Design an enzyme around this catalytic site. Structure first.
Site, PDB file in Angstrom:
ATOM      1  N   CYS A 136      21.065  63.943  24.254  1.00  0.00           N
ATOM      2  CA  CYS A 136      19.824  63.212  24.572  1.00  0.00           C
ATOM      3  C   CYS A 136      19.952  62.337  25.825  1.00  0.00           C
ATOM      4  CB  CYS A 136      19.357  62.384  23.377  1.00  0.00           C
ATOM      5  SG  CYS A 136      20.573  61.199  22.799  1.00  0.00           S
ATOM      6  N   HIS A 159      19.186  56.746  20.235  1.00  0.00           N
ATOM      7  CA  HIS A 159      18.641  57.914  20.927  1.00  0.00           C
ATOM      8  C   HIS A 159      18.100  57.519  22.306  1.00  0.00           C
ATOM      9  CE1 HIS A 159      16.734  61.861  21.229  1.00  0.00           C
ATOM     10  NE2 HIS A 159      15.534  61.320  21.346  1.00  0.00           N
ATOM     11  N   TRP A 195      13.149  64.973  23.166  1.00  0.00           N
ATOM     12  CA  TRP A 195      12.792  66.041  22.220  1.00  0.00           C
ATOM     13  C   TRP A 195      11.501  66.758  22.627  1.00  0.00           C
ATOM     14  CZ3 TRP A 195      13.475  63.260  16.812  1.00  0.00           C
ATOM     15  CH2 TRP A 195      14.839  63.040  16.579  1.00  0.00           C
ATOM     16  N   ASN A 237      10.381  60.739  24.776  1.00  0.00           N
ATOM     17  CA  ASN A 237      11.453  61.235  23.916  1.00  0.00           C
ATOM     18  C   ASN A 237      11.866  62.609  24.468  1.00  0.00           C
ATOM     19  OD1 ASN A 237      13.017  62.307  21.834  1.00  0.00           O
ATOM     20  ND2 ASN A 237      11.609  61.623  20.227  1.00  0.00           N
ATOM     21  N   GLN A 258      14.719  69.006  24.402  1.00  0.00           N
ATOM     22  CA  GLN A 258      16.060  69.057  23.820  1.00  0.00           C
ATOM     23  C   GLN A 258      16.216  70.166  22.779  1.00  0.00           C
ATOM     24  OE1 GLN A 258      17.589  65.233  22.723  1.00  0.00           O
ATOM     25  NE2 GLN A 258      19.580  66.073  22.082  1.00  0.00           N
TER      26      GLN A 258
HETATM   27  C1  LIG Z   1      20.951  61.541  21.016  1.00  0.00           C
HETATM   28  O1  LIG Z   1      20.196  60.701  20.141  1.00  0.00           O
HETATM   29  C2  LIG Z   1      22.424  61.266  20.747  1.00  0.00           C
HETATM   30  C3  LIG Z   1      22.804  61.509  19.269  1.00  0.00           C
HETATM   31  C4  LIG Z   1      24.316  61.471  19.091  1.00  0.00           C
HETATM   32  C5  LIG Z   1      25.038  62.672  19.151  1.00  0.00           C
HETATM   33  C6  LIG Z   1      26.427  62.646  19.000  1.00  0.00           C
HETATM   34  C7  LIG Z   1      27.088  61.433  18.798  1.00  0.00           C
HETATM   35  C8  LIG Z   1      26.368  60.238  18.737  1.00  0.00           C
HETATM   36  C9  LIG Z   1      24.976  60.253  18.884  1.00  0.00           C
HETATM   37  N1  LIG Z   1      22.637  59.850  21.088  1.00  0.00           N
HETATM   38  C10 LIG Z   1      23.524  59.446  21.987  1.00  0.00           C
HETATM   39  O2  LIG Z   1      24.277  60.189  22.620  1.00  0.00           O
HETATM   40  C11 LIG Z   1      23.548  57.933  22.217  1.00  0.00           C
HETATM   41  C12 LIG Z   1      22.542  57.635  23.345  1.00  0.00           C
HETATM   42  C13 LIG Z   1      22.490  56.133  23.702  1.00  0.00           C
HETATM   43  C14 LIG Z   1      22.075  55.217  22.539  1.00  0.00           C
HETATM   44  C15 LIG Z   1      21.590  55.886  24.920  1.00  0.00           C
HETATM   45  N2  LIG Z   1      24.917  57.576  22.614  1.00  0.00           N
HETATM   46  C16 LIG Z   1      25.772  56.964  21.798  1.00  0.00           C
HETATM   47  O3  LIG Z   1      25.482  56.619  20.648  1.00  0.00           O
HETATM   48  O4  LIG Z   1      27.022  56.705  22.280  1.00  0.00           O
HETATM   49  C17 LIG Z   1      28.000  57.406  21.477  1.00  0.00           C
HETATM   50  C18 LIG Z   1      29.310  57.539  22.235  1.00  0.00           C
HETATM   51  O5  LIG Z   1      29.698  58.915  22.212  1.00  0.00           O
HETATM   52  C19 LIG Z   1      30.429  59.198  23.419  1.00  0.00           C
HETATM   53  C20 LIG Z   1      31.637  60.055  23.095  1.00  0.00           C
HETATM   54  O6  LIG Z   1      32.241  60.463  24.325  1.00  0.00           O
HETATM   55  C21 LIG Z   1      33.627  60.774  24.120  1.00  0.00           C
HETATM   56  C22 LIG Z   1      20.660  63.021  20.713  1.00  0.00           C
HETATM   57  O7  LIG Z   1      21.106  63.903  21.444  1.00  0.00           O
HETATM   58  N3  LIG Z   1      19.938  63.262  19.617  1.00  0.00           N
HETATM   59  C23 LIG Z   1      19.607  64.628  19.191  1.00  0.00           C
HETATM   60  C24 LIG Z   1      20.705  65.259  18.326  1.00  0.00           C
HETATM   61  C25 LIG Z   1      19.380  64.856  17.694  1.00  0.00           C
END
Ligand SMILES: *[C@](=O)([C]([C]C1=[C][C]=[C][C]=[C]1)[N]C(=O)[C]([C][C]([C])[C])[N]C(=O)O[C][C]O[C][C]O[C])C(=O)[N][C]1[C][C]1
Ligand SMILES: [Ca+2]
Ligand SMILES: [Ca+2]
Length: 322
Positions: free
Chosen positions: A83, A240, A266, A264, A77
């Site tokens: 993620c 995540h 990452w 992960n 990532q």
């Molecule tokens: C993941 O951990 C992302 C981090 C993140 C980025 C932006 C917004 C929220 C979270 N995690 C997610 O996308 C999670 C994954 C699930 C728990 C499986 N999704 C989530 O929390 O749902 C949020 C809904 O957003 C949808 C909006 O659509 C319009 C990651 O990429 N971490 C790296 C950045 C460090």
């Protein structure tokens, strides 16, 4: 045969670029800020300002589409909240058949290269072929978003770009649902499990799904917002997406223990509890099992006992195929 997204025709475009002595530039998803995003990656944002679009053939003397196979270690990532998508790609690599539906054979930076690649996705209730040019977001000569542990390998970068394309921009991929990517790679049936209410046969369900090449992911719900930190005391990441990558049973001091393996996206930051890479538990299994299963590397992948897994994680998603 997959229908062409937007009517863009991979082979026709490739052959015409080759004939015309030019590299493809994608009018549908061009190398400009609107392909990056709209807010955090908008035209006037700090993140956008530092990005330059460059082809792999501009970065390296010997770029490669696939190196030593298209595998999960190829999914590292970058600086984007995708993620969920990346967990899904990493799980996809464990099923050879569906992997190479999504990632067609025959793509290279050598013979027949004209700066265009293609991938197949399940979109709009159809299997669709999506083209991209190979201009990629970079900063100081390195990819900003997904990249491979093999620094000259580009299939996963190009796939993440195609997925951004169908969603409108890279920023459109910030925050999401692992199962949504699972479906987009398979056309399959998704189900989820509340791990705090796990059925007594869940481990068998997991074994069977892995066997059939179903896609599995898991996560830890943040039930407070982030007032116990993003990372747990034992080095799990909350909110995540992780890929579930194996399930195997070891003989621990003469008694079977069910284990589960996860990764992960990452490509780093791992569980430090029992069965982690450096844990003492490995000393009490027979050396053959230890040698087959344990890999002492900071690679994002690690084992947990199933018992600890269902205590620590809250959600399991499984996407089942035909
Ligand atoms: C993941 O951990 C992302 C981090 C993140 C980025 C932006 C917004 C929220 C979270 N995690 C997610 O996308 C999670 C994954 C699930 C728990 C499986 N999704 C989530 O929390 O749902 C949020 C809904 O957003 C949808 C909006 O659509 C319009 C990651 O990429 N971490 C790296 C950045 C460090
Ligand atoms: Ca590889
Ligand atoms: Ca590891």
């Amino acid at each position: 045969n997959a229908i062409k997204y937007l009517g863009q025709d991979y082979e026709n475009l490739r052959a015409r670029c080759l004939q015309n002595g030019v590299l493809f530039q994608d009018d549908a998803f061009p190398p400009v800020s609107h392909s990056l995003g709209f807010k955090e990656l908008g035209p006037n944002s700090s993140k956008t300002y530092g990005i330059k679009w460059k082809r792999p053939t501009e970065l390296l003397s010997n770029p490669q589409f696939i190196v030593d196979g298209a595998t999960r270690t190829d999914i590292c990532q970058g600086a984007l909240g995708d993620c969920w998508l990346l967990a899904a790609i990493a799980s996809l690599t464990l099923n050879e058949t569906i992997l190479h539906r999504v990632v067609p054979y025959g793509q290279s930076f050598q013979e027949g290269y004209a700066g265009i690649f293609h991938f197949q996705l399940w979109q709009f209730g159809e299997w669709v072929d999506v083209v991209v040019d190979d201009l990629l977001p970079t900063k100081d000569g390195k990819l900003v978003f997904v990249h491979s542990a093999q620094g000259n390998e580009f299939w996963s970068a190009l796939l993440e770009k195609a997925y951004a394309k169908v969603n409108g921009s890279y920023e459109a991929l910030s925050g999401g649902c692992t199962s949504e990517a699972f479906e987009d790679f398979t056309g399959g049936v998704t189900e989820w499990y509340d791990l705090q209410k796990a059925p007594s046969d869940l481990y068998q369900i997991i074994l069977k799904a892995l066997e059939r090449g179903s896609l599995l992911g898991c996560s830890i719900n943040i039930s407070d917002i982030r007032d116990l930190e993003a990372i747990t005391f034992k080095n799990l990441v909350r909110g995540h997406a992780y890929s579930v990558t194996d399930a195997k049973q070891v003989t621990y001091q003469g008694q079977r223990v069910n284990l589960i393996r996860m990764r992960n996206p990452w490509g780093e930051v791992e569980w430090k509890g029992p069965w982690s890479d450096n844990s003492y538990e490995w000393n009490k299994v027979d050396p053959y099992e230890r040698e087959q299963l344990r890999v002492k590397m900071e690679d994002g992948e690690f084992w947990m006992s199933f018992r600890d897994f269902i205590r620590e994680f809250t959600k399991l998603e499984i996407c089942n195929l035909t």
